[PDB]
């Protein structure tokens, strides 16, 4: 009797097993991508950063943008580590914006829930906005599993 089994499929695949965060463009320019990092690697690393994403118009960049001259090859970068939270690192030639407020380039910032990054500032019609989606599931694993001292 697989009566219960049928219910298991109801919940479907649980998101947040490795997928750190997801970037979604609100202005409709760049295709939504999924950023992820392995938990084992994060827990194993007790120094420096674990995994960082590079975004821009470059096909190398962990994030492929549309084609904005105002933006650089790797306009912005996202780093995950420290303790468990997320960090946002701007790396554009023109600058990276957060909700209209320009942040310090190549600087680490505490990520925000459903936050948004604006880029290509200079001309009213040459600005592009992006949205960062973070899953609480990922945070649950980190909290449920503390580094060192196993219970």
């Amino acid at each position: 009797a697989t009566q219960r089994f049928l219910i298991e499929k109801f919940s479907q695949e649980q998101i947040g097993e490795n997928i750190v965060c997801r970037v979604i463009c609100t202005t409709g320019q760049i295709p939504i991508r999924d950023l992820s990092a392995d938990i084992s690697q994060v827990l194993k690393e007790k120094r420096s950063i674990k995994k960082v994403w590079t975004f821009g118009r470059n096909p190398a960049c962990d994030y492929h943008l549309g084609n904005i001259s105002r933006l650089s090859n790797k306009h912005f970068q996202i780093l995950l580590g420290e303790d468990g939270n997320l960090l946002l690192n701007d790396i554009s030639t023109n600058g990276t914006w957060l909700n209209g407020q320009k942040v310090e380039k190549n600087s680490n910032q505490l990520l925000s829930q459903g936050d948004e990054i604006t880029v290509g500032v200079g001309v009213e019609s040459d600005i592009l906005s992006l949205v960062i989606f973070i899953n609480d599931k990922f945070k649950q694993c980190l909290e449920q599993n503390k580094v060192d001292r196993i219970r």
């Binding site: 001259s69 030639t93 023109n94 200079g122």
Partner: peptide, 13 residues
């Protein structure tokens, strides 16, 4: 040579 720029960086520092 003569071509168009790639990344128009706003004059600033």
């Amino acid at each position: 040579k003569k071509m168009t720029f790639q990344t128009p960086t706003d004059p600033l520092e």
